[PDB]
Each structure stands twice: as structure tokens, then as C-alpha cells.
Amino acid sequence: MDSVDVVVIGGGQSGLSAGYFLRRSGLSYVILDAEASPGGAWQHAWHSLHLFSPAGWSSIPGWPMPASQGPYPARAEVLAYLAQYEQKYALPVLRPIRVQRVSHFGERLRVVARDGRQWLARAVISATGTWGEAYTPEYQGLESFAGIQLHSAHYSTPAPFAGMRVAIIGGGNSGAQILAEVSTVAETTWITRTEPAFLADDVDGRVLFERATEDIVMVPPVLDARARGVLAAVPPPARFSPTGMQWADGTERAFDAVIWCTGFRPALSHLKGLDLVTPQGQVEVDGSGLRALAVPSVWLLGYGDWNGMASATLIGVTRYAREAVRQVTAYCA
Amino acid sequence: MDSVDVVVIGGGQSGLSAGYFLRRSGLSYVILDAEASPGGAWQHAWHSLHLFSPAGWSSIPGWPMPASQGPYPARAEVLAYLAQYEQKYALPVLRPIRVQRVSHFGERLRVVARDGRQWLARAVISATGTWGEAYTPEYQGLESFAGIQLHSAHYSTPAPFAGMRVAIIGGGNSGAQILAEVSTVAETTWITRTEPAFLADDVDGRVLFERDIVMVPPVLDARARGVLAAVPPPARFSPTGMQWADGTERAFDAVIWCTGFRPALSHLKGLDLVTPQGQVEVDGSGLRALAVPSVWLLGYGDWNGMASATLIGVTRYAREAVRQVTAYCA
């Protein structure tokens, strides 16, 4: 049972960012991550994925992302970056470890792994991301649909959908990008809640970051899809049928497959039992967005806007990582 | 959407055995497996694990296990075997693929992967093993125990248990072996339902095939260190330990469940094949499913053939299953 000052849970961009700042502190720490390789959830993104901002705009603290081959970073490059980042700062990343549970051990916290390894931490920084909690909504008659379903989290390639009629549900960047790729081999139908909003052709995802005083980027395959005229959105249906869907007015479309691009929740099963997870799947944090209210020794990092505006982006996590790390450095004194 | 005659789900020793025979049939087939590497659930066994029979007695069809360095095969050798086995027979193993669902598509079956890939099969041989469905029983007050728990499926090394009081629950070969290893660094207590029965010192796991727990070297050792005393189940758990019928209390820092597994058949839910006992209802041969004739099952344990869930004993059922389906495809 190692005693450390800080345990960081999750070894993605968020955890590596926390790491960079903890290195410059005087504190003893470790970073626990469940994956086989470095790179967080990017290891699970689909093959064609590219970022929506250039390398300079996709960089975490200190060492920036190397310039990419094309205008936008490819999935591969993001992995290469995050790999080389750990080495560059020789960060204490133990991998693979699945943290099962964090629980009270007197004044400190006890972090337990699936295989019985244990750590004793004065502080914990949860940086586990969202990929692990894919969200599918509940629609009437869904349990009856005979076709194929998957979440965007497991989308990989358009091939399997060749020649099918396919519903893409969700109107974010993901929906748009996957719609773009699947429309190349399938009769496609984009189902969105509100009619989608595209940024301008001459601008990129850095814009979403610039709203940090407090929608979807025209990345090349999206430009292409627009030009092929497949970016028409339709409102949600009313019911699912065994073979398709049905709308308010009674119009019926058949589908062979459905791809849920309906987002994710924070992956905080390891904090259940500390009673920190709200029924909305978040935690209640202080005004800085970072520190948990019900248990002062737990900080959270990188999860999304409730945990800091644009914290769930490469560029935007840096600020909160700094703040979280100086906050805990104070706590350890 | 590939049409094949037979889809084998699971690329462990069971699936490779089904594979060996399907190769000698004239049939088109494929083997889908979820893991990163070959070797099935042996990739997940703990570091010190050795088999309880020699190599000759741990072999699947055709090409036998190479002789091992020591008297019993080590985890590493088992993986090496199963790796080379696939190359030797150039078996059609697609990996990694997670089969989500098998469902009716007219006369045939439709096998669907998590990422949308699809196959159209006249027949399906489920060989997904048990590792994926670890079983922990439900004891009173368990939710309250403050210490550490894991199933044997995630046991790895004794180090984390150094200096603790530790309960080992389950009295199989696993319990015994894990007890043997963890007793080297921890005050240990073996909790079993039935007082455990050891085979004789001069015999090994081949005996179990000739139809309880084998005296493999670390177990001999543990016997000699006097740590193989079993105790009956407790009555309830406390936050810091357990309590027996008579009211005696022992404290524990950790608990390791060696209480077995169920068959991993989530992919057959929805065909309504999975009994509430976690099995499926099969014909007299033990292999073919009753409620859906196009589904065979292989390697899952005694209900699916005596000693089917062993390296040596799966061979027979693989052959039988494969000749059964070869008949069905005609």
C-alpha cells in the first residue's frame, strides 16, 4: 500500500495535464489508467477521425502537439503526441489498472484496483473522461427494432453499412462526421432534436474555445457532405417500429441500422459509494468548477462544461489542470 | 455481410478445437474472438498459474502441446501453444470482435458485432467460455464489508496482500492454488462449503478426465506449510470481517472469491435460450440446443459434456459437434 499525496485517476489528455503541473509541484503522486496503451479514448475513436482544430490549437500544457501532416491532426497523431508526452515529462503512469473504488480512510482517501492493489492518497483528481458511459435515450418501441444498433463510441468504419438505409441520431460534430462517412455507402437519414448549426466555412474549432468568457465545425468531410447534399436534418420520430421509425404525423421510414450519436456521461462509477454522483450523472462542485462539494479531497478534471467551460477539449483542459493542481498543492500544506 | 456455413463464436481452446474439425469438413466457416491476443481466458489467468496435468494431457486435437520446461505447463506455454496452433492450421480467426447478438434471420442465423459487422450463418457454435461471467454469491451484510474484494478472475499476484488477513472463499483447484500463493505473504483463512477432497500425491488431473483437487507442487508445499485447513461458511459479513453460526468473529482486510463462473451467453439472450440457471437446454449428446436447432454449444462444463471445460476433454465434443453440424448442412 503506497502512500502518495495525490492520485490521479485516468491517463488521458486530462490526467497527463494534471500530471504536468504536479511534476512542478513538490508533491508525490501517481497516475492510474485502465487502457492497454497511452492515448485515452482516442484509442477507441473511429479510423478516419481527425481533430477539428490544428495542432497548435490541440495542445495541452508545456510541450505542444507537433505539426500535423494535413491541415487537421489525425487520430494517429493524437495518440503519438500523448504517448511522447508521457516520456517527455517521464510521468508516473501505471497502466493497465482499473480503479474500482475510492473510499474514506480517516482523513485520507483509499483508491482500490480491481486486482487488489491499493493506494493511500491525501487527494484524488478524477480524470476518467466520458467515453466509458455512452448515452442512448429511451424512445417508445425501441426494444422492438429488429435492425442493428450501435453507439458512436463503437463506430469504426462505413463498410458494414454499405447498401443499408441508416439513421444517424444526434446533431453534434460526431453525428455530422459519421453521417458524412456513412452517407458515402448508405442511404442516410440525420435525426436531430434541433435543427443543426454550422460554424462558417472559414473557421474552425478554436472558435468554440474562444467562448471561454462564459456549433459544428466545417471540417473537410463535412464540407464534402454538404456539397453532396446529405446534411438535411429531420426531427425526432415518435415511436420505433420493428423495421423503422414513425413520426408525429404518421410518416414511416424503414431502417436497417441506427447509429446513436447522442453523447456520453461522465465515467464516475469509481465515486459511487462516496455518494458524489448526482442522478444527472455529474457531481456538485464549487464555484471554480473543479472541487467537489460533499467531499473536499476530490477534484474533477476534463469532464465537460459543468466541470469548466471547454474542459473536455485538448486546449481548454490546461487552465483547469493548473487551477486544480495549485488548489490541491495548497490543500497539502 | 459475409454468408458462411458456420460461425464459431469464441477463439479459445474450445473454438480452435471446433476449428480443427471444421477445417477437415468441406464447410465455410469463421471464428470470431473478442480478445487482443490468442489464448482465450488464459491471458487473464494469474502470473504463477500452471496447469494440473502434463503437456501430453493438456492437448487439443491434432497438434499436441509441446513438452514443458517443468513437470506442469505454465500459463506462458499454454498461450504459446494456442498461438502456434492457429498458425499451424491457418485457422480463420477474426480478432478483436465482440459479438453482441445472434438473432433469427429466416431459416438462417444473423450474428452481429458491436461495431455493426454482420455475418449470415446456417449454424452457430457458441464457444465463449465462462471467464466473462464471474460468480460471487450474495451473503448477508456483504454490501457493508469495508475491505477489499476481488474474484479469482482478476487475481494476479500475492504482493498486494502482503501482511493482510485474507479470506479465500471457494474450495476448488483455484481456491487451493491461490490460497497456496497468498499464504506466502498473508495470514490466510480458507472458507469452503464442503470440506475439500484432494487427489493422491502420486496422481494428477488426468484422473479427472478418466471419468477432487490435484496435488500440484504449490499445493503440496502449502500442505507441508500447514495452511490447507478449511472452515465452513460464515453466517453474515460485518464491516471488518465475518461471523459464523456460533457467533465467532474473524477480521479480514481482503477477500478473494474463488466461487466459479457461469457461461458467457449474453449474445444468446433474446433467442430466449438462457435458462435462469445461466445454462441452455441441450439434447442428449449435451451439445445441441433444444429450443433452436441451429445453435450448438461447446466447452462450457459438465452440463455441456463431462470435462468439456478442459483442454484434453473438449476434443471429443468438438468432433461430435462438428460432425453434427456437418450433417445439418446437407
Ligand SMILES: Cc1cc2nc3c(=O)[nH]c(=O)nc-3n(C[C@H](O)[C@H](O)[C@H](O)COP(=O)(O)OP(=O)(O)OC[C@H]3O[C@@H](n4cnc5c(N)ncnc54)[C@H](O)[C@@H]3O)c2cc1C
Ligand atoms: C468523436 C469525438 C471527437 C472529438 N474531437 C475532439 C476534437 O476534435 N478536439 C478536442 O479538443 N476534443 C475532442 N474530443 C473531446 C476530448 O478531447 C476527448 O473526449 C478526450 O477523449 C478527453 O480526454 P480525457 O482525459 O478527458 O478523457 P479520455 O481520453 O477518455 O480518458 C482518459 C482515460 O481515463 C481512463 N479511465 C477511466 N476510468 C478509469 C478507471 N476507473 N481507472 C483507470 N483509468 C480509467 C480511461 O480508460 C481513459 O484512458 C472529441 C471526443 C469525441 C468522442
Ligand SMILES: Cc1cc2nc3c(=O)[nH]c(=O)nc-3n(C[C@H](O)[C@H](O)[C@H](O)COP(=O)(O)OP(=O)(O)OC[C@H]3O[C@@H](n4cnc5c(N)ncnc54)[C@H](O)[C@@H]3O)c2cc1C
Ligand atoms: C483458474 C483456472 C484454472 C484452470 N486450470 C485448468 C487445468 O489445469 N487444466 C485444464 O484442462 N483446464 C483448466 N481450466 C479450464 C479450461 O481449460 C479453461 O477454462 C479455458 O479457458 C476454457 O476454454 P474455452 O475456450 O471454452 O474458454 P475461453 O478460453 O475463456 O474462451 C475463449 C474465448 O471466447 C471469447 N468470447 C466470449 N464472448 C464473446 C463474444 N460475445 N464475442 C466474441 N468472442 C467472445 C473470449 O474472449 C475468449 O477469448 C482452468 C480454468 C480456470 C478458470
